[PDB]
Design an enzyme around this catalytic site. Structure first.
Site, PDB file in Angstrom:
ATOM      1  N   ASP A  16      66.430  30.797  25.846  1.00 19.24           N
ATOM      2  CA  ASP A  16      65.487  30.026  24.993  1.00 19.24           C
ATOM      3  C   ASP A  16      65.218  30.810  23.719  1.00 19.24           C
ATOM      4  O   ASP A  16      65.291  32.033  23.719  1.00 19.24           O
ATOM      5  CB  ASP A  16      64.128  29.871  25.665  1.00 19.24           C
ATOM      6  CG  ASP A  16      64.203  29.203  27.012  1.00 19.24           C
ATOM      7  OD1 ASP A  16      64.221  27.950  27.059  1.00 19.24           O
ATOM      8  OD2 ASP A  16      64.187  29.950  27.992  1.00 19.24           O
ATOM      9  N   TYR A  34      63.043  32.774  20.827  1.00 16.47           N
ATOM     10  CA  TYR A  34      61.819  33.619  20.799  1.00 16.47           C
ATOM     11  C   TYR A  34      60.601  32.709  20.666  1.00 16.47           C
ATOM     12  O   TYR A  34      60.590  31.851  19.797  1.00 16.47           O
ATOM     13  CB  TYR A  34      61.867  34.616  19.645  1.00 16.47           C
ATOM     14  CG  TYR A  34      62.919  35.689  19.753  1.00 16.47           C
ATOM     15  CD1 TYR A  34      62.892  36.624  20.781  1.00 16.47           C
ATOM     16  CD2 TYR A  34      63.867  35.847  18.761  1.00 16.47           C
ATOM     17  CE1 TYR A  34      63.814  37.654  20.847  1.00 16.47           C
ATOM     18  CE2 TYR A  34      64.802  36.868  18.817  1.00 16.47           C
ATOM     19  CZ  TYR A  34      64.781  37.774  19.859  1.00 16.47           C
ATOM     20  OH  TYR A  34      65.700  38.794  19.903  1.00 16.47           O
ATOM     21  N   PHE A  72      68.823  35.701  19.697  1.00 14.65           N
ATOM     22  CA  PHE A  72      68.405  37.122  19.601  1.00 14.65           C
ATOM     23  C   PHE A  72      68.132  37.542  18.155  1.00 14.65           C
ATOM     24  O   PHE A  72      67.394  38.498  17.962  1.00 14.65           O
ATOM     25  CB  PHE A  72      69.456  38.006  20.261  1.00 14.65           C
ATOM     26  CG  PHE A  72      69.554  37.738  21.734  1.00 14.65           C
ATOM     27  CD1 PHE A  72      68.520  38.103  22.581  1.00 14.65           C
ATOM     28  CD2 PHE A  72      70.651  37.066  22.258  1.00 14.65           C
ATOM     29  CE1 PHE A  72      68.595  37.826  23.941  1.00 14.65           C
ATOM     30  CE2 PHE A  72      70.730  36.808  23.620  1.00 14.65           C
ATOM     31  CZ  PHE A  72      69.702  37.190  24.456  1.00 14.65           C
ATOM     32  N   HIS A 119      76.199  40.596  34.653  1.00 14.52           N
ATOM     33  CA  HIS A 119      75.416  39.805  33.662  1.00 14.52           C
ATOM     34  C   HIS A 119      74.007  40.379  33.507  1.00 14.52           C
ATOM     35  O   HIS A 119      73.019  39.643  33.607  1.00 14.52           O
ATOM     36  CB  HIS A 119      75.466  38.321  34.051  1.00 14.52           C
ATOM     37  CG  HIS A 119      76.838  37.895  34.451  1.00 14.52           C
ATOM     38  ND1 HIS A 119      77.137  37.427  35.726  1.00 14.52           N
ATOM     39  CD2 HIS A 119      78.005  37.931  33.771  1.00 14.52           C
ATOM     40  CE1 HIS A 119      78.431  37.166  35.795  1.00 14.52           C
ATOM     41  NE2 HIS A 119      78.984  37.445  34.592  1.00 14.52           N
TER      42      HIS A 119
HETATM   43  O1  LIG Z   1      66.902  35.720  27.521  1.00 14.93           O
HETATM   44  C1  LIG Z   1      66.617  35.740  26.328  1.00 14.93           C
HETATM   45  N1  LIG Z   1      65.712  36.645  25.788  1.00 14.93           N
HETATM   46  C2  LIG Z   1      65.350  36.693  24.440  1.00 14.93           C
HETATM   47  O2  LIG Z   1      64.531  37.523  24.039  1.00 14.93           O
HETATM   48  C3  LIG Z   1      66.003  35.737  23.632  1.00 14.93           C
HETATM   49  N2  LIG Z   1      65.929  35.475  22.288  1.00 14.93           N
HETATM   50  C4  LIG Z   1      66.775  34.438  22.000  1.00 14.93           C
HETATM   51  O3  LIG Z   1      66.955  33.940  20.888  1.00 14.93           O
HETATM   52  N3  LIG Z   1      67.397  34.065  23.155  1.00 14.93           N
HETATM   53  C5  LIG Z   1      66.918  34.830  24.181  1.00 14.93           C
HETATM   54  N4  LIG Z   1      67.216  34.845  25.494  1.00 14.93           N
END
Ligand SMILES: O=c1[nH]c(=O)c2[nH]c(=O)[nH]c2[nH]1
Length: 223
Positions: free
Chosen positions: A64, A66, A77, A187
């Site tokens: 998902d 942030y 990320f 993973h």
């Molecule tokens: O598992 C996740 N952690 C995050 O901190 C992060 N941030 C993001 O954009 N995707 C994800 N996925």
């Protein structure tokens, strides 16, 4: 109309989920009407699909966006250049970057250069309600990103998958079912840190796998 929103290749690749994309569009309009907010910005939601479909050689999967206001920029990320400090997951990613590759700490958390070079930074779910982690699970994004991954795996072209979202048994199937797809196992996620993530050498191992499949490595070097 997909060709309005995403890159040419991506618009063709995602034709099958064109209506589901339109539906998510109606979902986000309904959220504003209902008085709830969403991230990232509407113009960044499909940002991962604005880089050439044909050029993608690595897939990094997150879960998902942030949930903190001002972090999500539509690349898994990544954060905008003026965001400091970095979220925990990205600091952890950058620690592995320096350890695996030997490069210095990046100047900021903008992963745009990875996207330009054929890294698909894809979240399974492409929107979130601010301050409510994973609030948009089950709203219809899963079918869209599943199709994107399905399409990518079906190319007669090398692909390395890095799974940083823990949905391994969800995603291993689609990917394993492509012609020239290597999946990095195990993973560990960035927040698992020293319990599996650090020393996983995702970057150098992606390049070993690409060269082994007759593809050019990624230049991972950030400014
Ligand atoms: O598992 C996740 N952690 C995050 O901190 C992060 N941030 C993001 O954009 N995707 C994800 N996925």
């Amino acid at each position: 109309p997909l060709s309005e929103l995403v890159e040419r290749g991506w618009a063709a690749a995602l034709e099958p989920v064109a209506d589901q994309v339109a539906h998510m569009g109606q979902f986000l309009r309904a959220e504003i009407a209902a008085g709830r907010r969403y991230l990232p910005a509407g113009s960044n939601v499909l940002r991962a699909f604005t880089f050439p479909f044909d050029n993608v050689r690595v897939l990094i999967v997150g879960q998902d966006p942030y949930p903190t206001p001002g972090h999500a920029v539509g690349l898994s990320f990544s954060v905008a250049p003026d965001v400091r400090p970095w979220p925990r997951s990205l600091a952890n990613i950058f620690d592995e970057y320096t350890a695996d590759l030997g490069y210095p700490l990046p100047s900021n958390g903008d992963l745009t250069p990875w996207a330009q070079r054929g890294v698909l930074l894809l979240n399974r779910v492409l929107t979130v309600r601010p301050s409510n982690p994973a609030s948009h699970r089950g709203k219809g994004w899963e079918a869209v990103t599943e199709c994107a991954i399905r399409a990518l795996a079906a190319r007669a072209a090398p692909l390395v998958a890095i799974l940083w979202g823990r949905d391994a048994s969800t995603l291993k199937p689609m990917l394993a079912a492509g012609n020239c797809v290597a999946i990095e196992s195990p993973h560990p996620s960035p927040l698992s840190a020293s319990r599996g993530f650090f020393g996983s050498r995702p970057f150098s191992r992606a390049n070993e796998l690409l060269v082994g499949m007759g593809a050019e490595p990624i230049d991972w070097r950030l400014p």
